[PDB]
Amino acid sequence: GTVLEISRSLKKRMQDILKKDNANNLEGRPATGKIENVEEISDILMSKALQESLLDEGILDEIKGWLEPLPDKSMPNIKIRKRLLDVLKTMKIHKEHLVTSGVGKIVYFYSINPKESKEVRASAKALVQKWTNEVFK
């Protein structure tokens, strides 16, 4: 029904933007899709009514992708890093969501990355500490 159609549409939108930015990074063309769309998409990802459908449809995979390094090893613009970590903090994420998505692995990297801003590192650390609770029930 409608809530699944909405969530699947948003998932595809995030996938398409990621693929295009990654292709453009390899090609040497501007890779501005994430930055141009992050505010809008992040607002939708915050919807409490959409949340469970989004998690059920594997949206953590696309969030992880958007936080991951570009093909040339560079990181996404810090505005993306900050806003997506803010999104993740708001979601009721449980063990099964984390195991299937692996989003913990990129957030873990943010928490230890020496190049990262102190603020983003601290945000990631807090998110790792929150999700560590899912290990202990």
């Binding site: 390094p69 990129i106 990297f109 560590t132 899912e134 290990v135």
Partner: peptide, 24 residues
């Protein structure tokens, strides 16, 4: 608590910090 088993679940989730080391 069996901490060995908790650690194994911790690794399923967070891996071992190696995943993106290539970046540095």
């Amino acid at each position: 608590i069996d901490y060995g088993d908790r650690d194994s679940l911790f690794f399923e989730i967070f891996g071992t910090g190696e995943e993106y080391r290539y970046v540095l």
